Design an enzyme around this catalytic site. Sequence first.
Site, PDB file in Angstrom:
ATOM      1  N   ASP A 124      34.808  39.615  50.033  1.00 37.48           N
ATOM      2  CA  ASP A 124      34.881  40.040  48.643  1.00 37.48           C
ATOM      3  C   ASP A 124      34.085  41.332  48.464  1.00 37.48           C
ATOM      4  O   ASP A 124      33.148  41.622  49.211  1.00 37.48           O
ATOM      5  CB  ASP A 124      34.355  38.946  47.732  1.00 37.48           C
ATOM      6  CG  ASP A 124      34.390  39.290  46.278  1.00 37.48           C
ATOM      7  OD1 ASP A 124      35.425  39.805  45.812  1.00 37.48           O
ATOM      8  OD2 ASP A 124      33.361  39.029  45.609  1.00 37.48           O
TER       9      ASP A 124
ATOM     10  N   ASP B 129      32.938  42.839  44.801  1.00 39.83           N
ATOM     11  CA  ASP B 129      31.972  42.790  43.714  1.00 39.83           C
ATOM     12  C   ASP B 129      31.086  41.558  43.835  1.00 39.83           C
ATOM     13  O   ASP B 129      31.583  40.427  43.937  1.00 39.83           O
ATOM     14  CB  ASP B 129      32.658  42.761  42.358  1.00 39.83           C
ATOM     15  CG  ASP B 129      33.326  44.073  42.028  1.00 39.83           C
ATOM     16  OD1 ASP B 129      32.674  45.110  42.200  1.00 39.83           O
ATOM     17  OD2 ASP B 129      34.494  44.072  41.578  1.00 39.83           O
TER      18      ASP B 129
HETATM   19 MG   LIG Z   1      32.708  38.735  43.749  1.00 38.24          MG
END
Ligand SMILES: [Mg+2]
Length: 219
Positions: free
Chosen positions: A9, A11
């Site tokens: 991922d 963010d």
């Molecule tokens: Mg995230």
Amino acid sequence: AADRGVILDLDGTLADTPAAIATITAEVLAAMGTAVSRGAILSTVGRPLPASLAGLLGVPVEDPRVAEATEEYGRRFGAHVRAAGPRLLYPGVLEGLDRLSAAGFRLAMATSKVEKAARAIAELTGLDTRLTVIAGDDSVERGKPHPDMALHVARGLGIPPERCVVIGDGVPDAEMGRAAGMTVIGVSYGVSGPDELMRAGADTVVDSFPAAVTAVLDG
Ligand SMILES: [Mg+2]
């Protein structure tokens, strides 16, 4: 060489963006002449942007107000990414990705950002030269929490799901990885606490990106 995959991922996992996302979401709403509860913004942080802004505005996702807001967010967030440069990233991220590559792990990004924004962030931060594949929410028909994004990048890496791990800070990341038949390492320093990530199916939770790297390296 490990000949295994690591699907990351962006963010709240690679990029220390949760606080900025909340702020800039608020800036955009104010630009659009409105405001919403703090807790409403916080519940969206790091989730797909049009859907999130539509929910906060309380309008259908296809309402023209949503595209106006997403465009304004792209301007403000793009400026933030130029101001942060590599400091967008948590400490040890580039070094850790280089060590995973050194050990023969193949690396991909699976983000809820749109792909063009993901690529631009990758380029400005230096993630781009470590990642073999980048996918975002619009790269596939069904984004997180569906498995599709993870299956798509695994194919691009040439690694089957059984040999991939997802690393993320969100329940949707854990759900995505489990649905895809992958192992999941949750991280506790982004938008979720450890118990939530465990309950969502993380195999383990760690407290720093270097600790996630260590987990992968040590098997
Ligand atoms: Mg995230």
